[PDB]
Amino acid sequence: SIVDSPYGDLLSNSIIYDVLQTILSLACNNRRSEVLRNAAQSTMIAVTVKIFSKLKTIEPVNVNQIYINDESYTNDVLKADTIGTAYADDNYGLPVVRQYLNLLLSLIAPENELKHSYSTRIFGLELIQTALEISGDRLQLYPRLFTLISDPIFKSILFIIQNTTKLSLLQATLQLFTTLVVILGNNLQLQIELTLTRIFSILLDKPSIIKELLIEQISILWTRSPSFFTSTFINFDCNLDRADVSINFLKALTKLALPESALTTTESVPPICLEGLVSLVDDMFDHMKDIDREEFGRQKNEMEILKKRDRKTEFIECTNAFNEKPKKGIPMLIEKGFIASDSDKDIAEFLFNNNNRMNKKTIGLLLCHPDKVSLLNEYIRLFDFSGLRVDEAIRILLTKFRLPGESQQIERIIEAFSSAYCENQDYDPSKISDNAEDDISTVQPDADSVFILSYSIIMLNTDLHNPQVKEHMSFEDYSGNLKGCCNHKDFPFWYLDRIYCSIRDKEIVMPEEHHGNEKWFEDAWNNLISSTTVITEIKKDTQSVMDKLTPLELLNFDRAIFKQVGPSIVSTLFNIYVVASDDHISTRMITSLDKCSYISAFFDFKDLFNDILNSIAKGTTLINSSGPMPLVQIKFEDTNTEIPVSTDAVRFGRSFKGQLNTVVFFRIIRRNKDPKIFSKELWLNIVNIILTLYEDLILSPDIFPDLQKRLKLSNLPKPSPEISINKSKEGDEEPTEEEIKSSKKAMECIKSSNIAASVFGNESNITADLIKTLLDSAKTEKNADNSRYFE
Amino acid sequence: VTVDPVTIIIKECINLSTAMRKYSDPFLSGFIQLRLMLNKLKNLDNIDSLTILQPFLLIVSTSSISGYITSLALDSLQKFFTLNIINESSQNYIGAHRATVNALTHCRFEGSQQLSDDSVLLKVVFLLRSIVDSPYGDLLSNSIIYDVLQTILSLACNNRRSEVLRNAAQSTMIAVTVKIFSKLKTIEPVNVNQIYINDESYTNDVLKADTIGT
Predict the structure, then answer these.
(1) Residues of B numbered 73-92 whose beta carbons fall under 8 angstroms of chain A's beta carbons: which are they?
(2) What contacts A529, CB < 8 A, 6 or more positions away?
(3) What are the SEC7 domain coordinates in residue numbering (chain A)?
(4) How many CB atoms lie within 10 A of CB A294?
(5) Hey, are the CB atoms on B122 and A178 less than 8 Å from each other?
(6) Residue A39 is nearest to which of B6, B14, B168, comparing CB atoms?
């Protein structure tokens, strides 16, 4: 009651932190109660809602500044329940929300698995999910909370996904992951790539229940994320130095859609995969609302992003060559379009940009060379420091470098760092002594001064973050060691205090941490955190790259992804349509096939379009190439009609899939706008289906009667029937009432298929090929089996 | 707010559907239908909130379901409320909230031992307090709020329950009384000239027995 009131909002950070501690201790302590625990959980949920709502109305601080991650992640611990039996003294703000997020992380920490129960971890994940769903982008604006979400919370999420079996923790973890990807997906690209790769790996090889839950949550991911698979394609497949997340995702979905994949997997997965594929097709179709395909054809240039995306395989080959040996890799990179020129500026730019798919230790070993020492001077000139209190400069330098073991190369690295630090910061003669806590106008060492300070910093890190070294290093000893420093003077007390504390409660992050096993997950996440979340420069972009793309380029990306993943999708769609048995699933499948035909016709994919149409024709089971039931024409004694009872008649009347595919096929033919899209097999199939539908059933030879009336010729001779009877019941007993009504149903379907306007009158289907095939498919022989209609 | 509430709705729908499937028919069908309808959507406009809440309210009101399922349903309802999924900018929000409160009032279930019953009843009472003490609860109806008073007071006075549940019911009753008379402070007074005669009967309303539960 207090917290959810203005009086609560006028409290202090320490008080509200103690409130959080006590309420959460009551909520997540066994042996207390159940009703009391639920009340405490609801109270904690409400308090979190209020806290982050208050966070929503606080302006950001230092928007233009660059943040160097230095705060520790193990400063808050949930103290044991004992109730019964800026700075503090302010009015809330960022300190309380930061400490609350830190405590929540301590709840779900991957190194605290043995110290907390599963209900506590699920509750912590739920609290984090509520906080995210309340704050979102406004939370993304602030740097420390975004760091605590990027590195450690997502590390915990990935660890839980990889190494859990309770499935109740897994459900909460997957829900939080989906919430993160939906809300703050555009700023957590690397984490999403890693998590999705792990999920695909686990899903393609543990009980089936885990895979079912994984696929269900990831399914709820793609439906609601705006225009999925194409944002993923753009951000990952076309960005290089990453993995083809979208293409691999679609390939795994196609591999998991067949019933052969329904085996040794939960049977509810295949419908989910089919929904995903249908969603991709529908998204592509919706992207073609009003595009005027002529305009698409008029386009000449291709997006340079796609051009580089087509060059990715040779990029991987060049990267492997570079990792093997730089003296051979560099000529290979400069031969192709990756490296602009042999100028060291371009080489430094490349070595700075793509520090994700380049062996960092190999980079360090290469860069120690003399010519590579000149390259190193240019490369560190490429950096940007603007102060950073020396230690943050060291962190920046070591983010994308593995220091070689030998001391000579370390000396070269540190001296180049000193020179670049001097160059990138213009010192001033102020040089204020104590009683000056800032670093811009005050601390101003020299080249050898910062050299000594940086060597001391490295020594302090390697001495204070190794458990195998007895004792530690104190502030007094370190300060005494750094006597005889800048300007032959000593550093200020505040400066050394800050440096010592910063290197104390944070280990310097370095890439290529280990090589082996038993720490593979820690190594992977270290090579992730080394890239981001140590530097968080907010670009304040309006949205993801999706919105800043013109509709033509969006359609181009759709065309590329379809070119990659089309044949597989259409193959699995036809497979499941053949297997399918239910009415609704078959109708949805054939609608998806119709949309696929439309999309193939839009992008002028002749092979795919003819493949899908020919598959429809062969599934029609009406144009097969390679017992005999004579056809019977039915005329009543009243209300004269025509009911031809033939083999194909009953075969069609007892084929739901047959009629569905016929009507869809002729609808597709109706929609067509180009004649030079079909194939010879396609034209043969359509001419044959129309001919066999003319032999019997309902295709009257009244097509284009205007010409017949022009020459005053009579109606065409109707093909004779094999066994024609006239009924007086309104004998030899050939027809049956149910087969009669089945033939009537087939007649109704065929007359509803509007064949005449579908095939002939479309102003485009009338081309040389159609009439040429019509003439070639003629008959010139007088056998009895065909004399019934030969003339 | 600004957090695409349709995503929260679909998450709760898939959660409840998965729970029912694991525990194991019209309720699951309604959840699936709502799932599809919301999936083919982009915001919450042009669709009445009563349709969104109807499966959840129906699964709350039904008597022959397990306590775990209705507990999950009530948790989903409270998450819907606390995130303001249904607001003043939604169709039939008056009807939606009135239906939610009506379904809560006549809640029933069956299942496990007294601890689970106490937990689900506590969730019910918390949701009723959260909704009445809010503006939306102020925009309820006379009969609905009278029924809320009847149910909460009956639960409080019943001696066959636990102690914590009775304390929670007492606290909620005090809060609801405070809210009712605080609203009474704002109503424009009735005729101050005509003389009133106390012909209205003094005893017609008798507290009913507890009905929510097994």
Answers:
(1) 78-79, 82-83
(2) A151, A509
(3) 322-466
(4) 8
(5) no
(6) B168
CA distance linking residue A304 with residue A238, whole number of Å: 10
Who among B7, B78, B116 is closest to A224 (CB)?
B7
Alpha-carbon distance of A669 to B115, in angstroms, equals 66
Across the A:B interface, residue pairs with CB atoms under 8 Å apart total 59
Longest dimension (CA), chain A: 125
Which of A141, A167, A224 is the best residue to mutate to test the B interface, defined by the most B CB atoms within 10 Å of its own CB? A224
Chain A contact set for B122 (CB, 8 A) = 35, 38-39
What CA–CA distance (Å, rounded) separates A323 from A328? 10
Largest CA distance in chain B: 66
Chain A contact for B174 (CB, 8 A cutoff)? no
B192/A200 Cα distance (integer angstroms): 76
Contact between residue A35 and residue B119 where contact means Cβ atoms under 8 Å apart: yes
Q: How many helices (H) and strands (E) does chain B have?
A: 9, 0
B176 vs B170: CA distance, rounded Å: 10
**Residue B175, φ and ψ in degrees, nearest 5:** -60, -45
* Partner-chain residue, chosen from A36, A49, A182, that has the shortest CB–CB distance to B82: A49
A533 Rama class: left (phi>0) / alpha (psi -120 to 50) / beta: left
> Using what technique was this structure determined?
cryo-EM
Mutate to test the interface with B, among A31, A45, A220 (most CBs of B within 10 A): A220
Q: Is B73 left (phi over 0), alpha (psi -120 to 50) or beta?
A: alpha
Q: Smallest Cβ distance to A38: which of B8, B83, B122? A: B122
Residue among A225, A144, A143 at smallest CA distance from A192: A225
Please report where in the chains the tokens 């190494």 appear, as a residue: A163
- Interchain pair B126, A42: CB under 8 A: yes
Residue from the list A39, A178, A223 with its beta carbon closest to the beta carbon of B122: A39
Burial bucket for residue A341 (CB in 10 Å: 0-12, 13-18, 19+): exposed
Tokens of B51: 């349709």
Determine the Cα–Cα distance for residues A535 and A147; give it in Å rounded to an integer.
Answer: 9
Of A84, A73, A72, nearest to A40 by C-alpha is: A84
Residues whose CB is less than 8 angstroms from the CB of residue A490 and which lie 6 or more positions away in sequence, other chains included: A479, A482, A483, A484
For residue B122, give how far its alpha carbon lies from the nearest alpha carbon of chain A (Å). Answer: 7
Show Cβ contacts of residue B187 under 8 Å, excluding neighbours closer than 6 positions. Answer: none
> To the nearest whole angstrom, how far is the Cα of A789 from the nearest Cα of chain B?
52
Owner of token pair 């100028």: A343
Contacts of A691 (CB under 8 A, 6+ apart): A777
Closest CB to A35: pick one of B8, B15, B119. Answer: B119
Residue from A4, A34, A141, A176 whose CB has the most chain B CBs within 10 Å, to mutate:
A34
Buried b (16+ CB within 10 A) or exposed e, B94-120: bebbbbbbbbbbebebeeeeeebbbbb
- Are the CB atoms for A383 and A396 separated by under 8 Å? yes
Judged on CB neighbours under 10 Å (0-12, 13-18, 19+), A114 is exposed
Report helix angle A269-286 to A208-224, nearest 10: 20
Give the contacts of A95 (CB within 8 A, at least 6 positions apart): A13, A86, A87
- Rounded to a whole number, what is the distance in Å from the CA of B189 to chain A's nearest CA? 30
Give the phi and the psi of residue A188 in degrees, each rounded to 5: -130, 45
Phi, psi dihedrals of residue A176, rounded to the nearest 5°: -65, -40
The first and second tokens of residue A443, run together, are 């601390």
